[PDB]
Symmetry: D2
Subunit: 106 residues, 4 copies
């Protein structure tokens, strides 16, 4: 999908996690976020259309998605241990990564 | 594009890394492998077309790409520090992940 | 040495990172924090002296130090690439992990 | 403990994992390996007594224990999902990290 669609997927599923009651909802939202992050890894954001794909900027840009993917990976493991509250708390971790990339690149 | 194309990208660039002389070659090959792994994350492999997308198998399948992506992430950091030999020996780490997924699902 | 000493090491060096100007200061503070986190991994915190060492609590407790160690690991890689501001903003990531463990066990 | 004691702990528990029948044995061995790796993070190995503690060598040395700690972290998550075979296969991952550090530093 395009960067904007992936971002709406990330935004909708982050809310599902913050509002969730059971593990299955959290697991499903985390899996959908991981798919959106991986698909978004390739995208060139507007602020960086001018820059070459192996510029310092596009490397740092892509590095943000590695942070997020890793955070989702750990969150799903916690979710798969019945630790709903601990997996929901991952949301707080994910939001930092969301804001850090936004601050630099949208 | 498809799982088989992503795999040939992973295979070709793994060899480039093993036969590389300088950092730029290693960096470029690692970046291409990361793109292939991320793009492959969503694929349903032939031996798992029968299985449900939330089966233990498709979860374990996807988990393999998280391991590889994480390994590529660290390898590129080492590559970006001029540690060519340390980044090349990441290749040895990557091959274990290649074989583990292949053993179960190829 | 003890959990409280490790925590003051983490606290002092987190501030050094937030107020740093150059890479060497950030690198040095991150290295000291990594040493404190690793050394703290084995500690039994007061609020968990009652609990068995393989309880869900002491496992979750130890898991917190794995998150922090991983965050410090990535921060030092960024620091070693001359990306001072990117390494300093790791501080924001670290504080979430500090608070999550404190909320449950301090 | 000293580096040699930590190494014997790593060696004994790696064998327990390769020989294990149930999750509890694997979980317990992984937890003991994590404790040994964290405690070993601080050690100065013989080949590097001459070198300063913030030399490139002692940084690369310590980086090896970050790889191992991360690998143990993932292995324990797999172990905590009843995936004994998948957690035992982590052993193959750990041995690469063992050999890579040995090759450079013992
Ligand atoms: C980069 C590494 C990013 C990460 C990680 C996250 N986001 Fe993002 N997001 C990013 C960019 C470059 C853009 C702009 C895209 C454009 O074409 O304009 C966005 C946009 C959004 C939006 C759209 C709203 C807007 O103000 O433009 C949303 C709703 C959004 N992002 C949400 C979001 C969430 C929830 C994230 C983590 C869970 C997240 N983003 C991470 C770049 C990056
Ligand atoms: C799963 C998580 C995998 C990881 C990690 C890696 N590979 Fe793979 N690979 C996988 C599957 C399911 C398949 C078969 C797909 C099919 O349609 O039949 C493959 C296949 C390959 C191939 C052969 C491709 C072909 O021409 O048919 C190669 C050469 C290959 N894989 C290489 C490779 C390398 C080098 C990897 C890591 C560096 C790697 N793979 C990881 C599943 C998975
Ligand atoms: C658990 C996994 C923790 C993480 C991660 C961090 N901290 Fe911590 N901290 C923890 C405990 C259990 C305690 C209480 C110990 C006790 O004996 O009562 C603390 C305490 C602190 C303190 C106060 C120390 C004192 O003088 O009594 C500080 C200032 C502190 N912690 C800071 C801190 C920082 C900055 C962290 C991350 C960067 C951090 N802690 C992580 C448990 C855990
Ligand atoms: C460095 C980052 C290391 C990692 C990771 C592992 N090992 Fe190690 N090991 C290391 C050093 C520097 C030494 C030498 C210590 C000395 O004072 O001589 C060792 C030693 C051992 C030994 C002792 C046998 C010997 O030939 O000296 C064993 C049995 C051993 N190490 C096992 C081991 C295992 C099983 C590991 C991973 C699971 C492992 N080591 C990782 C440095 C490092
Ligand atoms: Cl980030
Ligand atoms: Cl290694
Ligand atoms: Zn929506
Ligand atoms: Zn974890
Ligand atoms: Zn899992
Ligand atoms: Zn960040
Ligand atoms: Zn594609
Ligand atoms: Zn690293
Ligand atoms: Zn980088
Ligand atoms: Zn594996
Ligand atoms: Zn101590
Ligand atoms: Zn990184
Ligand atoms: Zn380094
Ligand atoms: Zn947390
Ligand atoms: Zn022994
Ligand atoms: Zn995992
Ligand atoms: Zn756990
Ligand atoms: Zn290695």
């Amino acid at each position: 999908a395009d960067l904007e669609d992936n971002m709406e997927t990330l935004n909708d599923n982050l809310k599902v996690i913050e509002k969730a009651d059971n593990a299955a909802q959290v697991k499903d939202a985390l899996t959908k976020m991981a798919a959106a992050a991986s698909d978004a890894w390739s995208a060139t954001p507007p602020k960086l259309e001018d820059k070459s794909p192996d510029s310092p900027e596009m490397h740092d840009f892509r590095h943000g998605f590695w942070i997020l993917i890793g955070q989702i990976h750990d969150a799903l493991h916690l979710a798969n241990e019945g630790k709903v509250k601990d997996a929901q708390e991952a949301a707080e971790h994910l939001k930092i990564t969301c804001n850090h990339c936004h601050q630099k690149y949208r």
